[PDB]
Paper text:
ARSs assemble into a multi-synthetase complex (MSC), which is comprised of nine ARSs (arginyl- (RARS1), aspartyl- (DARS1), glutaminyl- (QARS1), glutamyl-proryl- (EPRS1), isoleucyl- ([name]), leucyl- (LARS1), lysyl- (KARS1), and methionyl-[name] synthetase 1 (MARS1)) and three auxiliary proteins (ARS-interacting multifunctional proteins, AIMP1 (p43), AIMP2 (p38), and AIMP3 (p18)) in vertebrates. [name] is one of the least characterized ARSs in the MSC. It is a class 1a ARS and has an [name]-I domain at its C-terminal end that is formed by tandem ~90 residue repeats. The overall structure of GgEARS1 consists of an N-terminal catalytic domain (acceptor end-binding and dinucleotide-binding domains) and C-terminal anticodon-binding domain (proximal β-barrel (Pβ) and distal β-barrel (Dβ) domains).
Upon packing, a wide groove with a width of 15 Å, height of 10 Å, and depth of 11 Å is formed between the first helices of UBX1 and UBX2. A total of 2429 Å2 of surface area becomes buried upon complex formation. The first interface is formed between UBX2 and the helical subdomain (stem-binding domain) of [name]. The second interface is defined between the two [name] domains and the extended hairpin loop (22 Å long, residues Tyr684 to Pro696) of the [name] Pβ domain. At the tip of the hairpin loop, two conserved Ser (Ser688 and Ser691) and one Tyr (Tyr690) residues are present. Although Ser691 is not involved in the direct interaction with the [name] domains, Ser688 makes contact with Glu1216 of UBX2, whereas Tyr690 interacts with Leu1198 and Asn1206. While mutation of Ser688 or Ser691 to glutamate retained the interaction of [name] with [name], simultaneous mutation of both residues dissociated [name] from [name].
Residue numbers in the entry:
A (entry chain B): 980 to 1006, 1008 to 1093, 1095 to 1165, 1168 to 1263
B (entry chain A): 189 to 706
The structure:
């Protein structure tokens, strides 16, 4: 009967590519979302077990519902198959693989006057503008709103020195206090973040790297990055403030990040940065 | 100056096409027009030449109004060629009805052949009625009218190509941006321009000397119609060395990515040229100094920059930037951290004062460091005389450190080396700054005819250098023109930005080098 279920899986497969032919789409990075309404019933079982097979012959990915609020629906069909109702939606571009921060960072617990959490990128773009302990203190002072008031940085229980190589502590959590080592170091970044990959052009302002990272908040819960801010900050990272930029969710450059994106959607995704000529 | 010109009664027009960006050539025409408008208390018409519903767009119209605004040109009236479509059509029908214009269906390539060989087309001698019938087909936009054009009946034998029955009107079923579909028939520039200059009252039509052939044509149309005859004043086209002005050539740089876009400081657009640090007044004085000259010289860019240098020198504040990579720390142990105010300008007390910070930890240029000797009295600019005591070097012989003794009671400044410097103090942190230098895009100054600019592309026309800037640079805004002492004039392209919460870094002050005339 596995050849019976494979023949039903082939009927879903055939259903999908007929939809590809409806939108004049020619193998075009796309994604296929599906819902077999009588949940867990026959047709939903078939499609899940055979998802590798379906993926192999329809060279696009195969995820279930719901479609992301961000993606533009190419088509949406509902038909019937072996006593289930079967919704197919095709959407532009491939998927959105979440990745770790590209630049060396440091989680920050700042106990002066309450506890504040945040992150400090130690370089931006990757390979440039690497941070000093003195640079770190200044950056902590601006972002967190502190004066250089006996500001002491503790790696765990050691106190750091103008010689400590900050980059070698890239995953760690540091403590900013007023001169008194703490007690009591998370793993995940305490702040939402995005990675940036420059694709079209090379960084300016003597910057050098083509990959960067933007926190979306600092300290945690403060200073929510806006869409227009993302455009400006992207430009600042690579030294492209004069240039007109387009941000894309794929490297194919088909899911363009738009002013009505939801910023939380972007978290941990790599944003692709494209420089276009300034025309009118 | 202008023949036939009276005070208060001069009327000039600047009639760009909204096919793209204004460049320095358009800048000259607009400023020459404004010059005659201001000096004669006359009127300046800013006329969009929208005869063609296919070469213009609403997109460049707005661009062009911004460029004109950036040149501080205030037209008294804004018109469009399309505003007179009705009247222009009527003058065409007048000429048809007088045997002065006929309609030709001869295909264009043959038509240019016959025009090339002083050969009259089959239609030149059509009676008025046959011309009026074909003209009706163009007006209605029929497929036969679409292959017809209205030509003036002048002289197929003239040495002046422009007199060999030029096209006055074409049939295009195109809808027009401002007139929509009222008209399926559209006049050529050659025909519209004399008429609209006459209607709008233009007393002096400024054209580049390259239009000289069309002046004869221009005046024929005026006389053939029997209307107000504007006076044509011809000035020389701007020929700048190392520079191309054609949209199709400029576009290649944009498309090849050799340039940022149309406002790139290497482009001769008015946008790019102002971004480079040209001032309007510097431009205005250059145009006025050569005025209405008809000799088409090969102008050197340096001659414009020297006019600009005279405008910015008296008013540009002086600040300091040190080349970050080569900077040498200097110990001034006696000095205490303090701040004094000092003139921003070396000769114009109007510019005001800047704060200077002093202290025991100071930085100087490596290039200057390597020229110092021990026991030398050196003037630190805005500070005073300082004695070099020890030059500390490393195992390779590189100065890595300099020790000094204050010598401030020594007020002798005749033969001392005068160096720039910046104090390292948390009370006035140094501002990260980038200095940008641009070169010409074409390495050959004058291209002969039949020579292709693409063989002389300068592929290294931008250079950036990382600097430690004067603390006062943090407040510069885009457009501020300043002088980096001992380096030159610069314009702020992007201001400094403090540490970002999102990128955890500052943005540097971006200064573009302003060529001075050398």
């Amino acid at each position: 009967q596995s050849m019976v279920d494979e023949g039903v899986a082939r009927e879903v497969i055939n259903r999908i590519q007929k939809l590809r032919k409806k939108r004049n789409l020619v193998p075009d990075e796309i994604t296929v979302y599906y819902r077999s309404h009588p949940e867990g019933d026959y047709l939903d079982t078939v499609i899940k077990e055979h998802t590798d097979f379906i993926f192999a012959t329809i060279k696009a990915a195969l995820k279930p519902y719901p479609v992301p609020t961000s993606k533009e629906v190419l088509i949406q069909e509902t038909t019937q198959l072996k006593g289930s109702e079967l919704e197919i939606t095709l959407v532009r571009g491939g998927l959105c693989e979440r990745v770790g921060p590209a630049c060396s960072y440091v989680n920050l617990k700042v106990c002066v006057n309450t506890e504040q959490d945040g992150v400090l990128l130690l370089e931006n773009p990757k390979g440039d503008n690497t941070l000093n302990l003195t640079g770190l203190v200044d950056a902590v002072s601006c972002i967190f709103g502190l004066k250089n008031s006996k500001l002491t940085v503790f790696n765990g229980k050691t106190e750091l020195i103008n010689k400590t190589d900050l980059l070698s502590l890239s995953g760690k959590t540091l403590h900013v206090t007023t001169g008194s080592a703490p007690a009591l170091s998370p793993d995940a970044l305490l702040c939402q973040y995005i990675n940036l990959q420059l694709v079209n052009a090379k960084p300016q302002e003597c910057q050098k790297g083509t990959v960067g990272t933007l926190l979306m908040e600092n300290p945690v819960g403060q200073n929510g990055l806006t869409y227009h801010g993302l455009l400006h900050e992207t430009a600042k990272v690579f030294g492209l403030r004069s240039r007109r930029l387009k941000l894309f969710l794929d490297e194919a450059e088909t899911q363009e990040i738009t002013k009505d994106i939801s910023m939380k959607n972007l978290n941990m995704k790599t944003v692709y940065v494209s420089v276009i000529p300034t025309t009118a | 100056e202008l023949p036939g010109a009276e005070m208060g009664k001069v009327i000039v027009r600047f009639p760009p096409e909204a096919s793209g960006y204004l460049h320095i050539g358009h800048a000259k025409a607009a400023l020459l027009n404004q010059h005659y408008q201001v000096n004669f208390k006359g009127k300046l018409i800013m006329r969009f030449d929208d005869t063609n519903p296919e070469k213009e767009k609403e997109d460049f119209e707005k661009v062009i109004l911004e460029d004109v605004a950036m040149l501080h040109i205030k037209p008294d009236q804004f018109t469009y060629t399309s505003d007179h479509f009705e009247t222009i059509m009527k003058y065409a029908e007048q000429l048809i009805q007088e045997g002065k214009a006929y309609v030709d269906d001869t295909p264009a390539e043959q038509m240019k052949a016959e025009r090339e060989q002083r050969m009259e087309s089959k239609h030149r001698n059509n009676c008025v009625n046959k011309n009026l019938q074909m003209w009706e087909e163009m007006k209605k936009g029929t497929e036969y009218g679409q292959t017809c054009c209205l030509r003036a009946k002048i002289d197929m034998n003239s040495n002046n190509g422009c007199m060999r029955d030029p096209t006055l009107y074409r049939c295009k079923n195109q809808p027009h941006p401002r007139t929509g579909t009222t008209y399926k028939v559209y006049p050529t520039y050659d025909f519209a321009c004399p008429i609209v200059d006459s209607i709008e009252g233009v007393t002096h039509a400024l054209r580049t000397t390259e239009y000289h052939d069309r002046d004869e044509q221009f005046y024929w149309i005026i006389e053939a119609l029997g209307i107000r005859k504007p006076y044509i004043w011809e000035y020389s086209r701007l020929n700048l060395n190392n520079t191309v002005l054609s949209k199709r050539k400029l576009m290649w740089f944009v498309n090849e990515g050799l340039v940022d876009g149309w406002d790139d400081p290497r482009f001769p657009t008015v946008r790019g040229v102002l971004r480079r640090g040209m001032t309007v007044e510097g431009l205005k004085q250059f145009i006025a100094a050569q005025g209405s000259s008809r000799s088409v010289v090969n102008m050197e860019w340096d001659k414009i920059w020297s006019f600009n240098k005279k405008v910015i020198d008296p008013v540009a504040p002086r600040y300091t930037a040190l080349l970050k990579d080569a900077v040498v720390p200097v110990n001034v142990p006696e000095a205490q951290e303090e701040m004094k105010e000092v003139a921003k300008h070396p000769k114009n007390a109007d510019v005001g004062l800047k704060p200077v910070w002093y202290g025991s930890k100071v930085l100087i240029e490596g290039a200057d460091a390597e020229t110092l000797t021990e026991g030398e009295v050196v003037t630190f600019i805005n500070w005073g005389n300082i004695i070099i005591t020890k030059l500390n070097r490393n195992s390779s012989g590189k100065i890595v450190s300099i020790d000094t003794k204050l010598n401030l009671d020594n007020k002798d400044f005749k033969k001392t080396t005068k160096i720039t410097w910046l104090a390292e103090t948390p009370r006035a942190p140094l501002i990260p700054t980038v200095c940008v230098n641009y070169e010409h895009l074409i390495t050959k100054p004058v291209l002969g005819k039949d020579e292709d600019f693409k063989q002389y592309i300068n592929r290294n026309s931008k250079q950036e250098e990382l600097m430690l800037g004067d603390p006062c640079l943090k407040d510069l805004k885009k457009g501020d023109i300043i002088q980096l002492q001992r380096r030159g004039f610069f314009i702020c392209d992007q201001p400094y930005e403090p540490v970002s919460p999102y990128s955890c870094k500052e943005a540097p002050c971006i200064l573009i080098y302003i060529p001075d005339g050398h």
